Amino acid sequence: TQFEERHLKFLQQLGKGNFGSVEMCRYDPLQDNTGEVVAVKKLQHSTEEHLRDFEREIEILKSLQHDNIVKYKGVCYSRNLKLIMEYLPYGSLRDYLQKHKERIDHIKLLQYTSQICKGMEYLGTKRYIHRDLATRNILVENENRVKIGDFGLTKVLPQDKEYYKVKEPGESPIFWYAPESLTESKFSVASDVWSFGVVLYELFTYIEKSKSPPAEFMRMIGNDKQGQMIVFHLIELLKNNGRLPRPDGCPDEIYMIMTECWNNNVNQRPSFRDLALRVDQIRDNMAGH
Template sequence: MCQRCGSGASGGEEDCEPCESDLRFVPRPLGLTGTSVAILDFATHTNYTFHVEAVNGVSGLGGNTRPLVNISVTTDQTGPSLVGVVRKDWASDNSIALSWTEVEQQPNDILDYEIKYYDKEQEQSGYSSTRTKAVSVVVTGLKPATVYVFHVRARTAAGFTAYSNKFDFSTGDEYSGMAADQGQVLVVVTAAVGGFSLLVILTLFFLITGRCQSFIKDKRKSDDKRRDHFQNVLPVPGIKTYVDPDTYEDPTQAAHEFTTEIDPSRIRIERVIGAGEFGEVCSGRLRTPGEKEIPVTIKTLKGGYVERQRRDFLREACIIGQFDDPNIIRLEGVVTKSRPVMIVVEYMENGSLDSFLRHHDGHFTVVQLVGMLHGVASGMTYLSDMGYVHRDLASRNILVDEGLVCKVSDFGLSRVLEDHPEPAYNTMGVKIAIRWTAPEAITNRKFSSASDVWSYGIVMWEVMSYGESPYWEMSNQDDDDDDDDDDDVILSIEEGYRLPVPMGCPVVLYYR
C-alpha cells in the first residue's frame, strides 16, 4: 500500500493520501507471492510511505492491529516544472485532441510527455495512458458523450515530473457526430477535389505553352538555358516556379542554391529506422542555431559511391529544398563537405500513411480521414502551382506527424521520363507503381498534374479503406508473377473496371 505525504513538519497521517493509482507497480501492488516489487513513475520532490504486510487466510479475522513494515522514500527535485494549462482543441464521438503549454526555462530537456486519462464516472475502474513527444496529442478509442479526466506530466533524463492539474473534457455525441460528419465531409471534399481539379485545367494550359517554349529553348546556347527557365517558364507573375536541378550543368551549384549546408557536429544519429536506395535512413537530433534540439530523419549516402550516385542522392534534396508548404516534407539541410553525405528532413512520428492506417484500423471518424485527404490535396495543389509533377503519389509516400498532419514526400520518381522501350520503367531503372499510375502515363509516359489526380484518387481509396492494397483481389500469392498481376490491373482498367466503394465511405466522397 502506498501513501503520498506532505513535506510539513507534522508528518502525520493527516497529511497523506493514497497514491497507488499514480504509480506503476511491477508486477502489481497486491497479491504478490514473491518478496520484491518494482515501483515506477515517482513524482519529484515528494514524500512516499509504503506499507508492506504479509497476508494469509485468517489475516482479516483478528481483532488486533495488523503488523506492517513502513518504508519512507523522498524523491529529489530533478525534473522540470509542471506542464501548463491543458486545453481541448477539438473532439469527435470517440476522440479528443489536446494541447498544452510548456513552462519557460525548463531545468532539463523534456524527452516526452505522458497523458493519463479515465472515465470520470468510473474512476475506480482504472485508467489509460499514452505518450507523445509533441505538446499535443489525439486520444482515440473513447466512448461517445462521455466526460474524461486528463492530466499530463513530462519526462526528462532524470525521470517524471508530477502530473499537471486535472482537466475534464467531453467527447461528442455519436448521433449528432454522424450528421456533422456528412456536412463536414461535403464541404471539405468539395473544396479539396474541386480546387485541385481547377488547378489541373490551368496546369494543362501551362504545360502546352511550356512545350512551345521548350522547343525554342532547345535551339539556344546552353549558357542561356537557365536564364530562359526563370524568365519564360513562370506562368503567372509573382508565383514561384519549380526549377529542375538537372538543368544545372554544375550539380553543386543547384545544391548551393536550394539547400542549406549543416555542420555535421550539430547532428546526432540515434538509431537506424530503415534502408533507402542510396544508404541507411536514421532518426536523430539536430541542434538548431538557438541551441534547441529537434527530432529529424537522416538519409545517408553509403560509402564507395561514384559521382553520379552522389548527384542523384542530392537531387531529391534540391527538389524538396524549393518547397515551403505545411503539407510537404520540410528539408532541414544537407551535409556535403564531409562523409557520410547526408540529407536531413523533419521527423514524422507516425511514419507512412498506409502503415499508420493499417495499425489504427477503424479508430478514426470520417471527418478525420477526410481531414488527412485534405492535407494531401493541399500539398499536391501547392506542387501543381509550382509546376511540379510528383509521378509517384501513393499513401506509402505520405508521412504523418503526431498531430495527424499528412505531408507529401519521396520525390525519387520526379525525374523527367524519356523514351524507353519498356513503359513499366523510368530512366532511373525504377519500376513504375502500376496500381497508382494513370493509364496514359503507363502506355504513353505522359505524366502531368492530371495523372497526379488519378493517383490522388487511389490514395483517397486507400485512406477510406484503412490502407488496403488497391485492386487487392487481383494480387497473387507469390512475388514471381507481379508483372502478370500488373497486366491484369491494366487490362481491367482499360475495360472500365474501377475500385469499389470502401466500407463506410460516404456517398459524397465516392464517385465512380
C-alpha cells in the first residue's frame, strides 16, 4: 500500500480533471522491467484545501471493494501525495464507445448500464454521493466489464440528512446536474440517479458530437446565451419539462428509464436497485433469456 516514488517509472499522461491528473506508470522496484503498470492520480496544483479533499477521496476509494469500482492499490508520499490505482487498458467508456460504435450493440450497452447501476448501488450502501456520473468517468477493464473510475467529487452524506449541499468553485458539469443541484447545490442518491439517466442517454447516442448533452441543451436554450445566463436558462428549461430527446435507434423502454431518472420530483426518481432489475429484465427479453 506504500509505493516509493523512486520506483514509479512514468509511461504516459492518461487524462486531466479540473484539479487532479492521471498518468500511466510502471512500478518497477527491481528495475528489471517486470513491475506492474499502475494508474497514478496526482494534484495538478498542490494547495491545502485540494490536499485535504484528495486525502478524503483516497479514504473513500480505499473503503470501496466492488467489481465495478476501480481498485485502490496504495499511496505515494514524496506532501506530494499520489493515489495508486489498478491500470485499466481500454480507457474511458466515452472513448471506447466512440471507437467501437459499429461493433457495440444495445444488449452490450445494457450490460455496461447494469454494471454502472450495481457499482452505484454499492456507493449508496456506504452513503457516498458520486456527484460526477458521466461516461468520461467510467473506465473499461475489458469488452465485458466497466468500472466507476474516479471519485474526485464524491461526498459522504451527513448521518442525519439524505442530501449534501456543496458549491465547488470553478466550472461544474451542469448538463449532467439534477435541477435541485443547479438551484440549491443539493446532492443526493436521487441527483446521482438523474446523472445516471444522462449517462444512459450518452451511451445510446454512441457519443455523437452533435448529440452530446451540452450540444442538445445549448440548442434548446439558444447558442446566443452568455455564461451565468446558461445556468438560469437551463433551470427554466428543466422546470418546464424540457428534456434531452430520445437518441436515434433508442427503444422506447430505454428512453422511458431515462425520462423517469429525469423527474423534477426528487422522491419520484427510481432507485439504483430498481434500475438494475429493469435493465436486466430488458437485457433478458432482448436475449430471449
